[PDB]
């Protein structure tokens, strides 16, 4: 029930610790950094979580589906498999457990180039293990043929971007022996995916790359304004996306034209390591809030980026959300929540998605809203310090509203979930007005491709009111195992 949430939170804690350790290394002068000399942030984070009892399913083998782990789930590090107890061994490709007097495989890691042909997508050929011997793992995978017991398959790319993918449950059908190219016998196993499971994510991505893709009903809702086109897909009905004036960047009315923020004195990328003063690093409380790869280290009340009069180059480490969308986004028709947003590739945890763009207005003007309050985003105090607290145990609301009813960007189409994979992060760079930060969405999960993007709308129950002025209700259809059942 809450096992999905405990899995996601466990991973979130792991990656938070990883990015903290890495931040710590990136703050050091290049000469004293450990990244070169065998820094293993995954192993340190792993150790920290283990020594605090954070590992799930430890000391127990599971055959078949693991609670809270779903088909399509992606992992950046192999040790995540260890932390969740999906796949116990540190290095070995095959994991197994006792079954009667024998042993059957519970899990395999097919690391590498995988076959990408669509008419064989349910079938997998797996190499075993100078001759390979029918012992331990190989023997267990062979016994799986006799028992017809399910095997978990994890696809491993030969880093950071969707390195391990859980592809679901397979049955082992046969095995044989042949000379490998190293010159000795190896074992080969044929597995078949069990019918009834969600489609493989690589299959969906592959089908999505075609121009004859099912349901494709618009090439670019951006109308050529975003640097990459944002398409629209509808496999549900024949409805087309709502019309609105697409707006890439937030445009300030004259009542809040930016007063020029306090600038920067660095001729190159800002970092803690370079020792002369950077004002923008002090704005962030003496830290760089991003890792050097662009990922947010961890949610904060406010992040300060370098602005228009900082002498920094575009690739400064404090310049991230200001460069706009980089992911290949698209909107698509949901069954019961109107239009939603998703991405055509994996999104690494910590990645910036997009801004909530629209017309800025004061609250008072906000309470007089007529027409569409579906696209009203109230700024102020969405910061969630849960993760920061959890990690510490290991180691002012705003009146203003963004109205995207008439003018906005793709962010207006992002739906609500009670178990969200995104969060809202306040960012300042072209001004220092605390009342009206940019609302920047970041990933708080490693997001598999084509998984719907969602954040917490954070409405208070029984405070959303009628056209005539009284309490209104709306049900939440987010489908999460722990759904709070009402949107407002
Ligand atoms: C900012 S709009 C998001 C895009 C919208 N779905 C559309 O088609 O234009 C918010 C509206 O989407 C719908 N919505 C978003 N999340 C929902 C959820 N979890 N359950 C039910 N409706 C949802 C609600 O009607 C809500 O008023
Ligand atoms: Zn800078
Ligand atoms: Zn600087
Ligand atoms: Zn600066
Ligand atoms: Zn819900």
Swiss-Prot record:
Class in the EC hierarchy, top level: transferase
S-S bridge residues: none
Binding-site list for S-adenosyl-L-methionine: 337-339, 373, 375, 412, 415-416
Question: Record keywords: Kinase included?
Answer: no
Ranges for domain Pre-SET come to 262-324
* Residue span, SET domain: 327-458
> One GO molecular function term?
histone H3K9me2 methyltransferase activity
| Protein keywords | Centromere, Chromatin regulator, Chromosome, Metal-binding, Methyltransferase, Nucleus, S-adenosyl-L-methionine, Transferase, Zinc
Q: What are the GO BP annotations of this UniProt entry?
A: methylation
Domain Post-SET, chain residue ranges per copy: 472-488
Domain annotation text?
Although the SET domain contains the active site of enzymatic activity, both pre-SET and post-SET domains are required for methyltransferase activity. In the pre-SET domain, Cys residues bind 3 zinc ions that are arranged in a triangular cluster; some of these Cys residues contribute to the binding of two zinc ions within the cluster.
- Known function: Histone methyltransferase. Methylates 'Lys-9' of histone H3. H3 'Lys-9' methylation represents a specific tag for epigenetic transcriptional repression. Seems to act preferentially on dsMRNA.
| Name of the protein in its database record | Histone-lysine N-methyltransferase, H3 lysine-9 specific SUVH6
Q: Which organism is it from?
A: Arabidopsis thaliana
Lineage, uppermost ranks: Eukaryota, Viridiplantae, Streptophyta, Embryophyta, Tracheophyta
Q: Span of the full-length protein shown?
A: 267 to 790 of 790
């Amino acid at each position: 029930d809450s096992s999905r949430n405990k899995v996601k939170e466990t991973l979130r804690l792991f990656h938070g610790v990883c990015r903290k350790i890495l931040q710590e290394d990136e703050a050091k002068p290049e000469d004293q950094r450990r990244k070169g000399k065998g820094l293993r942030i995954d192993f340190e984070a792993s150790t920290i979580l283990k020594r605090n009892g954070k590992f799930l399913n430890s000391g127990v083998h599971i055959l078949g589906e693991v609670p809270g782990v779903e088909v399509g789930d992606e992992f950046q590090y192999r040790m995540e498999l260890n932390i969740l107890g999906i796949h116990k061994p540190s290095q070995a490709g095959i994991d197994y457990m006792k079954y009667g007097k024998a042993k059957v495989a519970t899990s395999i890691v097919a690391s590498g180039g995988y076959d990408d042909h669509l008419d064989n997508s349910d079938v997998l050929t797996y190499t075993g293990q100078e001759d390979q011997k029918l012992i331990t793992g190989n023997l267990a995978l062979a016994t799986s043929i006799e028992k017809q017991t399910p095997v978990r398959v994890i696809r491993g790319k030969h880093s950071k971007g969707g390195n391990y993918v859980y592809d679901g449950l397979y049955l082992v059908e046969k095995y044989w022996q042949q000379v490998g190219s190293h010159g000795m016998n190896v074992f080969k196993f044929q597995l078949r995916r069990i019918p009834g499971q969600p489609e493989l994510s690589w299959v969906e991505v592959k089908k999505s790359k075609s121009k004859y893709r099912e349901g494709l009903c618009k090439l670019d809702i951006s109308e050529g304004k975003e640097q990459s086109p944002i398409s629209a897909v509808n496999e549900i009905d024949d409805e087309k996306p709502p019309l609105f004036t697409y707006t890439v960047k937030l445009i300030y009315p004259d009542w809040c034209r930016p007063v020029p923020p306090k600038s920067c004195c660095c001729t190159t990328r800002c970092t803690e390591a370079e020792a002369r003063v950077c004002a923008c690093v002090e704005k962030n409380g003496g830290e760089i809030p991003y890792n050097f790869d662009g990922a947010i280290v961890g949610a904060k009340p406010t992040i300060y980026e370098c602005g228009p009069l900082c002498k920094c180059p575009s690739s400064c480490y404090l310049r991230v959300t200001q460069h706009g969308i980089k992911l290949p986004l698209e909107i698509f028709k949901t069954k019961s929540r109107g239009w939603g947003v998703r991405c055509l590739k994996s999104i690494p945890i910590g990645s910036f998605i997009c801004e909530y763009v629209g017309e800025l207005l004061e609250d008072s003007e906000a309470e007089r809203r007529i027409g569409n309050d579906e696209y009203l985003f109230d700024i102020g105090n969405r910061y969630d310090n849960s993760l920061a607290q959890g990690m510490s145990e290991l180691m002012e609301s705003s009146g203003f509203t963004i109205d995207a009813a008439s003018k906005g960007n793709v962010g207006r189409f992002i739906n609500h979930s009670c178990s969200p994979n995104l969060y809202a992060q306040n960012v300042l760079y072209d001004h220092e007005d605390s009342r009206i930060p940019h609302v920047m969405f970041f990933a708080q999960d490693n997001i598999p491709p084509l998984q719907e993007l969602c954040y917490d709308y954070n409405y208070a129950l029984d405070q959303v009111r009628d056209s005539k002025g009284n309490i209104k209700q709306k049900l939440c259809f987010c489908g999460a195992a722990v759904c709070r059942r009402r949107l407002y």
